[PDB]
Design a protein around this ligand. Sequence first.
Ligand SMILES: *Cc1c(COP(=O)(O)O)cnc(C)c1O
Ligand SMILES: *Cc1c(COP(=O)(O)O)cnc(C)c1O
Ligand SMILES: *Cc1c(COP(=O)(O)O)cnc(C)c1O
Ligand SMILES: *Cc1c(COP(=O)(O)O)cnc(C)c1O
Ligand code: NA
Ligand code: NA
Ligand code: NA
Ligand code: NA
Ligand code: NA
Ligand code: NA
Ligand code: NA
Ligand code: NA
Ligand code: NA
Ligand code: NA
Ligand code: NA
Ligand code: NA
Lengths: 380, 380, 380, 380
Amino acid sequence: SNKKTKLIHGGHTTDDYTGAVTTPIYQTSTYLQDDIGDLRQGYEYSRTANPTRSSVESVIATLENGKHGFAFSSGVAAISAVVMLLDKGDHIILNSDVYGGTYRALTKVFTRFGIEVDFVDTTHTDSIVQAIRPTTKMLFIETPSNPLLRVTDIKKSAEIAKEHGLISVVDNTFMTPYYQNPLDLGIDIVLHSATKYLGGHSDVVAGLVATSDDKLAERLAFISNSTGGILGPQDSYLLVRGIKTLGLRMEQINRSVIEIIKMLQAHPAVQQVFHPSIESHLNHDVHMAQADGHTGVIAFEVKNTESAKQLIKATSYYTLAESLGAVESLISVPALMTHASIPADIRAKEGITDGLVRISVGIEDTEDLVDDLKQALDTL
Amino acid sequence: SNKKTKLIHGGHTTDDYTGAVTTPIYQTSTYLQDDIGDLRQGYEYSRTANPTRSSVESVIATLENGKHGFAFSSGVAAISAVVMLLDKGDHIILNSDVYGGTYRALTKVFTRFGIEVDFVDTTHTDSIVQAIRPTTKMLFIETPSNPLLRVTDIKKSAEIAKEHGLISVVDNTFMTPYYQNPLDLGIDIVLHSATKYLGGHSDVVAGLVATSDDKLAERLAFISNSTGGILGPQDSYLLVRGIKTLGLRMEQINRSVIEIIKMLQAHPAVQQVFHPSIESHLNHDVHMAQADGHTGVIAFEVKNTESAKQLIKATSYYTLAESLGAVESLISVPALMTHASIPADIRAKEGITDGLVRISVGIEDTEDLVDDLKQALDTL
Amino acid sequence: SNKKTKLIHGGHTTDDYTGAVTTPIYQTSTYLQDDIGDLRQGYEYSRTANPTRSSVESVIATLENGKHGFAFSSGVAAISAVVMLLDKGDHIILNSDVYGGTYRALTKVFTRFGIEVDFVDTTHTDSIVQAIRPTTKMLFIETPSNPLLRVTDIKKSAEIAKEHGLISVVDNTFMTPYYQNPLDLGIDIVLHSATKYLGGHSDVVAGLVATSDDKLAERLAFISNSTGGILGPQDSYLLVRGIKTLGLRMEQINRSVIEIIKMLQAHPAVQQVFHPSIESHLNHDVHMAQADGHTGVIAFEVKNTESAKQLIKATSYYTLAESLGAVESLISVPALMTHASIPADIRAKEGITDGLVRISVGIEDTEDLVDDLKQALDTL
Amino acid sequence: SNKKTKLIHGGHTTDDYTGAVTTPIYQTSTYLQDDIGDLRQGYEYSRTANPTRSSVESVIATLENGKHGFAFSSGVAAISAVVMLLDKGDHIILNSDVYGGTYRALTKVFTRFGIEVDFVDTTHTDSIVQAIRPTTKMLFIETPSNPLLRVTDIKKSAEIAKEHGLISVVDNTFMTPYYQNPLDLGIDIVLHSATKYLGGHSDVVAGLVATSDDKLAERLAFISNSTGGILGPQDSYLLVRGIKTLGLRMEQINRSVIEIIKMLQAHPAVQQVFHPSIESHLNHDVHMAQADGHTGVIAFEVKNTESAKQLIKATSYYTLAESLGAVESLISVPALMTHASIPADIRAKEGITDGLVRISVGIEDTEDLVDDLKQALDTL
Ligand SMILES: *Cc1c(COP(=O)(O)O)cnc(C)c1O
Ligand SMILES: *Cc1c(COP(=O)(O)O)cnc(C)c1O
Ligand SMILES: *Cc1c(COP(=O)(O)O)cnc(C)c1O
Ligand SMILES: *Cc1c(COP(=O)(O)O)cnc(C)c1O
Ligand code: NA
Ligand code: NA
Ligand code: NA
Ligand code: NA
Ligand code: NA
Ligand code: NA
Ligand code: NA
Ligand code: NA
Ligand code: NA
Ligand code: NA
Ligand code: NA
Ligand code: NA
C-alpha cells in the first residue's frame, strides 16, 4: 500500500523453507540436481542465479514497479551491462554532465568497441531530438545529475525514445525508488548504484537494474551470465537489509536538506546553491512533476579553495570521504576530487569553481547538521 | 620455499594494524581522508581497491610468480576484462575446445563489438602460426581443456606470442598455481575461475588474474575500475581461506585420480579415458614438461546415455552437480548438460558421445572413490 | 550532541588503519605478537577481545552514557553473566513479571547454584524495601515489562539499591538507549537483548551490557572471558550497522504506536489496552519522568482465543512470529505462545487472558498499520 | 565409509530446499509460523535452534559417533554448559594439568556456586578411584593434556565412571574426532574447542559438544537455551567449511610431527621432548590403543628463557601467537605466556621450565618445518 509498507513487505525476502523472516545467505556456487536437468528450485549455478541475489532482484523490481531485477557487482558494472545491449556502430545519447565513471566507461572503454556517444544538454529535450542520428539506439539520462543537480524531463525523454525506437535508460541513483519511478513514466530500464542510498550504510558496492520489458530482461540476463559482473550473496543480503530503512533514511535526509538549504541561502559566505527544491532551479517544476521528494546531494559555492578546505576542517559532523548516500553526512570539493584533471578554465566554465562544495546529507539530527555547517561557514 | 609453505606464508594475509593472523573483512565502500587527496593506506573507494580484495590479489600474484593480481566477480568477468584489453578490429586466437562460457562470451558478446575470433586446434602450435593474421593481438589457451583434456604447449605458445607481438593468456583453472605456472613459461597473463579449485569449497564465484607486466596491469586495473566486475570482500576472504588448503586438496585429488584411472582402464564397461597422465594421451610429454601434477577432471566413455544415468544413480559418493574443484566428487554428462544444443552428429564427431562421463575428483578417501565408481560400473 | 547525531558518530566504528568508514569484520581467533607479551593494539585472543566486538561494546557504552561495554552471544547470556556476579547464598530481587527466559534461567539454572530469588511487584518500590534480606545482593528490574508493560521507578530503585549496598540492574531492552538511560539515573548495570530493537532487523541474536563502574566492569570481563558467552564478529558488525538507524526506527514506531492506541481505545471489539503512554496506566507519570519516548510493544484484550486467531489471520501487515523490535510488525498470543504451561485459571488471574494479543509495532506506514489492524478487528 | 569420505559426506550440510551443496547461512533471529505452534521446519527462535548451527551440530555428532550435537560461542562456553549439568554440593574430578581456561572457570567461577573440584593425576586411573567422594558426579579428562601431553586411559576412565554413576566427559580438542572418539569408548560427553583444529583456520572461536545420551542431551539443550552461549550462524558455517579439510590437515600435521620429533631428539640444544608418539612417553601404549594418530602439539626443553626467545626470533615459519590448530605453525613459551602467574619454583617443579617451548605444527611443507626449526636451534 503506502511506500514505507511496501519497503518492508515488497519483494520476496523470507525463506519459504524454514520460515526465516530474513533472506538466507546462500554462500554457495552450485546445486544438487535430482536428475539431469531437474532443478529443485530452479538453481543450478550461482553465476546464473543465486537465491540471495534473487531476493535483492525481486526487491528492486518491486520497488521500481518493474518485472525483472538484476544485481551487479557495482553501479558501473550495471551500466556496462546495459551498454552491452548495443553493438559496434550503434549510438548513445547521454546527458552532458553524466557521472564521471559513466563518462569514463563510455569514452575510454566502449568507444574502443565502436559504440558512438554524444553528450548533450538534456535539460531541453529538443536537444535530444536534435542529437538523434539514424544509428542512435539508446538514450541514457541521470536526473538530477552530479554535482550541479541538473533536472531532465523523464516522461518527455521516454516519449522521444518511444517515437524514435530507442531503449530509454534512467540512472535513478540520486532519487532512489522511494521518490522517483522512471519505469512508471515510460522508461525502458532503470538502474542504480546501490552503493549509495539503497545499501545506505557505506558497506556494499553494488548495482541494481530493473525493467518491465521481457525481451530487454532476457538480453540483460544473457549479458549478466556471459560477462559475469554479478553481485555476491553476502552483498545481496546487506543490500536487502539496508533497503528496509530506505524510506525512514530518505525522509530524515529530506528534512535536513530543506533546513540546510534555508541556512545556505541566508548565509553571506555562500553564493550559488544547486538543488532541485529551489524554485529558481532550472526544471524545478519538472522535478516536482516526476518526483515526490529530493535527493540529499547539495552543491554550493564558497569563495575559493582555501574557504572550502576551511569548511571541511571546521565541521564536526561532515566527513571528508568519497561516495554519497551514507548514514554519515559527507563533504567533498569536486574541483579537487572529481574534476582535477579538467583544465582549470574549463572547470570554471562548467561551474565547477574552486569553491564549489558538495555535501551528501546523512541522517544526523537536523539542527546539529544545520548548526555545524553554519558555524563552520561563520569561520569564513 | 616449498609449495605447501608458500601457500601458507605467501602473499599478505594478516592485519598489520592489530596483528590478526587472518585478513580482516573490509565490508565497506569508502574511506576517510585526513586531507583532500591524502589516503591513510592508499584506499579511497572500494570499487577501485578494497584491502580484503588486495589480500587475495597479493595471494594469486605470489602463487603464480607475478607482480600484479586482480579479483573479479567470476571467472567469466576475469576473461571479459582480459578480452576488453583489445579493440574493435583486433583478432584473438583461442583453442578450439575452449570452455563453453568463454566461447559464448567471445562469439555472442564481443563479436558484436567488432572483436574477431578464430578457434584452432592448439595441440599443434603451428596451427597457431597458421592462424595468425595481421590484426591478431591475443593468443588465449586453456590447458588441459574441457572435457577431453587436450594439452597445449605453453612455452611454445609464449614464444610464438612474443615473436608476433601477441598478448598471451592462459586459463590455468584446471591445473591451479600449485601444479602449473604459465607466467614462468613466458605467458603474459594467467587467469583462473577461482570458483573451482582455488576457493575449493563450492561456496564462492570468483575470477583471479595475475601478470608480471606493469603496463598490462595498468590496463587491467583501468578496465576493472571502469567496468566494475570486482569481487566483494566476503568472497575475497573465503578465497584466501580456501587457498590455504589448496596443496593438500590437490595432492589428495591426484592420488585418487591415479588410482581411479587404473580402475577405469581395467574396467570392461569403460572404453576411452581422457586425462593427461595417460602416456598415450596426446601431448602427455608436453604436460609433464610444463606441470608437476594433474587436474582432477577425468572424462571416460560408457556405452550410452542410459549407462551414464545408471552410473550416476548407482554411485554413493559422486554427486550430480555443475562445476568442479569441490571437496565433493562431482559427476556429469557433457552431452546432456554442456553440449545439448550442439546437434547430435556433430557432438559425436567431436567425441562428446552420449556415454561420455566427466568426473571431478574430490577429497574423499581414495579407496572409497575407486570402489564406489567400480561397483557402479559393475552394475552396467 | 542530539540523539540522532550521537547514534551516527558515537563510539568507535571506523578503521583507524585504512580509514574505512565502517568497522572491519575481524573474522579471526588470534593475533601475532611482535615479542612475547607485546600486543600491537591490545589484542591477543578473540575470546578475550576482538576489535569488531570492541566496536559494538564502545557503541553501547556511549549510547547508555557508561564507561564499559560487553557483547554476549544472546540477551540471556548477558543476563547470565550479570547473575554470575553473585555467589551461592546471595539473594536477588526481580520484578514479578520478568521475562520468561530470565525467570527460567534464575529458577531452573541459578537456583541449583544456591542463588536465591524473589519476584516482587516493583511498581511500588516499598515492595523492594520489604523484600530485602540480609543476603540480598542484587536488584534486577525490567521496565516496562512483558507483556502488560508494568512500569517501575528506576531512580527510586537505584536509591534503594545504593542505600542497601545492592548491585542495581535494569533490562532496558523494550525502551532502548534512545529513550531511557538507566545509568544516568544511578543504576549500576544496564543490559539489552540486542536481538530486538538494537539490531532491529531480526537477523542477530545478541546481548549488550554497559556500566560506568570500573570494578563491576572488571568482574564482568572476567566472567565473559571465563564462561565465554561472547558475541562473534559478524554479529557484532551487524549490530553496529543496525544501531545506526535506531533513532529513525524508534521514532517511526512511536508515531504508529500513538495512532494505533487511539484506534484500539476506540474500537468496540477491544477491551483493555496495556501501554505506558495511556494516562490511566499505572506509573504513567513515572515512565514519562524516566523516558522521553515509548516502547513499540502493545498488549490489548479481545474476547477469546478464536477472536485472537481471527485477528492474526485477517491482518495483512502483522506477522505471526516470535521476538519483537523487527522492521516488520509482529503479532502473538501470550497465553498460547509464552504462558501456555501456566494453568489457565492462574493465567486469567495474572491478566494473561485467552484473548490477550501482543503486537510489536514495526516501521511500516502508520496509516497502513492502523487501517489493517482496524479492518481485522472489524471482522470480529 | 573411510574417515576422509565421512568428513565430506557425513552430517547434513546441503540445502534440501534449493539443493545448494553448502549449508545456507541463516543470518536470522526468528521464523514465520503458519499457525500458532505450527513450525514449518521446527524453527521458531534462533537462540533455541538455527538451521546453520543445526548443520554444524549434526556434523560433530556424526564425526564423534554420537546422537546429539551442540555448538557454543567458545570452547569454555561448552565446558561451562557441561559443568552446569551439576548442582551446588556436587563434586568433579579433573586431570591435574587441565587447560588453564578450564582451571580458571572451575576454581574462580563455579566454586562460587558450590561446585567442588579436585585435580588429580589421571595417568594412573586408580587416582580417580581414590578421589571419588560420595558427592562426586562428574569425571572430566583431557588427553593428551597441555603442554606436557600427559595421556589418560579413556576406556578405563569410562568404566570407572559407569561403575560409580558419574557423568564422564572428555575434552577431545587436541586429538580431534579424526583420531580419537571417546564416545566409542563409553564416555558420556565429548567436547572440543572448535577454535583450534576443527575450524582449522584461526578465524572462529567456538565450542562443540556431542553425546549419545538422550537425557544428557535434553539437559544440555535446556542449559544452552537458558544461558544462551550459542554459536552464531556465520561462525557455524565457517566451522562446517573448515571441518571438510580436517583429515587432510591432520595427516599433513602428523607427517611433520613425526619428522620434527626425530630432529628434536637428535639435536644437542634440545633436552626433553614431550609427545605421545615417543615410545618412552608415559602411557604411550594407552594412547596408541585409544587413538590412531597424533596431536600436532609438541613441547620440548631448551636451556633457558633467552634460548627460547632466540628460537622464536630465528624461525621463519613458526609464528609467535596464542592458540593452536592453525594452518600456520605456532610457537610459544608456556612459562611466559600461560603460566607466568605461577611462582617460578612451582613452575620448575611441574616441568614448566624457562626453556620449555610449545609448538603447534601447521600444514607447511614438512622439510621446511624441520629445516627451519633445526637451523634456529643451530643458532643456540
Ligand atoms: C502497497 C504494496 C504494493 C503495491 O505498491 P504500489 O505503489 O501501489 O504499486 C506492493 N507490495 C506491497 C508489499 C505493498 O504493501
Ligand atoms: C618459498 C617461498 C617463496 C618463494 O617461492 P618460489 O617458488 O621459490 O618462487 C615465496 N614466499 C614464501 C612465503 C615462500 O615460502
Ligand atoms: C552529542 C554527542 C555526545 C554526547 O552525548 P550526550 O547525550 O550529551 O551525553 C557524544 N558523542 C557524540 C558523537 C555526540 O554527537
Ligand atoms: C562411512 C560413513 C559413515 C559411517 O562411519 P563409521 O566410522 O563406520 O561409523 C557415516 N557417514 C558417512 C557419510 C560415511 O561415509
Ligand atoms: Na514480502
Ligand atoms: Na514501458
Ligand atoms: Na569536517
Ligand atoms: Na605472508
Ligand atoms: Na614475461
Ligand atoms: Na551418484
Ligand atoms: Na565515532
Ligand atoms: Na553510578
Ligand atoms: Na496477519
Ligand atoms: Na551429508
Ligand atoms: Na555410552
Ligand atoms: Na619465528
